[PDB]
Structures are given as structure tokens and as C-alpha cells.
Amino acid sequence: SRYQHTKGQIKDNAIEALLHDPLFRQRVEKNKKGKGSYMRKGKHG
RNA sequence: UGAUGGGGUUAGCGCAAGCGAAGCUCUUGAUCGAAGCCCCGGUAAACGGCGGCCGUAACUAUAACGGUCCUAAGGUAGCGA
Numbered sequence: 001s002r003y004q005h006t007k008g009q010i011k012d013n014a015i016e017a018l019l020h021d022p023l024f025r026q027r028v029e030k031n032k033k034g035k036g037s038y039m040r041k042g043k044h045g
Numbered sequence: 046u047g048a049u050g051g052g053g054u055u056a057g058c059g060c061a062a063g064c065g066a067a068g069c070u071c072u073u074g075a076u077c078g079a080a081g082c083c084c085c086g087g088u089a090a091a092c093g094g095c096g097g098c099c100g101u102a103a104c105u106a107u108a109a110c111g112g113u114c115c116u117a118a119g120g121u122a123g124c125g126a
Binding site: 006007010011012013014015016017021 | 104
């Protein structure tokens with residue numbers, strides 16, 4: 001199925017417009033433990 | 046205003062050229078001499094003037110931004126085929 005992208009009416013490049021689109025934003029994950037790992041309640045209980 | 050210097054003329058000293066004092070003259074004109082101009086600042090509802098180039102962002106585009114040259118200063122608000 002289709003994808004409703006950000007950049008309305010992409011002209012030239014058909015692949016370097018989507019690279020800035022939030023489909024290809026940088027997925028950064030969370031640490032544990034690690035500079036930024038506070039729980040407050042974890043996955044269970 | 047006329048210093049100072051130069052020239053003409055001639056009483057005279059030299060039988061020669063030549064020099065030549067006073068006086069009268071022709072000329073040069075140092076000195077003294079103000080505003081103005083140059084110079085110093087001001088004033089634009091005084092006359093007037095009020096920029097180029099070159100890049101630069103999340104496809105493209107455009108450039109908020111940056112570089113550099115020049116000017117007395119680079120046109121601001123408002124409007125604008």
C-alpha cells in the first residue's frame with residue numbers, strides 16, 4: 001500500500017527526498033543501564 | 046606707500062675712448078595693506094543624493110545568514126505592473 005510522504009510534489013530525486021522524510025529519521029534506542037536509563041516502573045508489575 | 050638696484054642726460058676728471066657728482070627724469074618695485082579664496086566647523090521641510098558581486102537550508106526552489114569590493118550614505122516606514 002501507498003505511503004503519504006512529507007514533501008509535496010517531489011521533483012528531481014526520487015530517493016533523496018524520502019531520506020529527510022520521517023520514514024527515514026534516525027531511530028535511536030534507549031539504554032538500560034546507560035546515560036538515560038531511569039525506570040520509575042519497568043515492563044512488568 | 047615707495048625703499049633698493051638698473052638706465053638716460055651732464056658740471057666735471059682725461060687732447061682719446063671712458064668714468065662721471067647734484068638735479069631732473071625712465072624703470073624695477075622690498076615694505077605696509079582688508080574682505081575674498083584656500084583652510085576649520087556647521088546646517089538637508091537648503092540644492093541634492095540614498096550600491097555591486099559571490100555563495101549559503103530537510104529532493105527542488107528561494108535565501109533568514111555569510112564573504113568581499115566601493116561610497117558622503119547605501120531607500121527606512123508606507124505603497125507598488
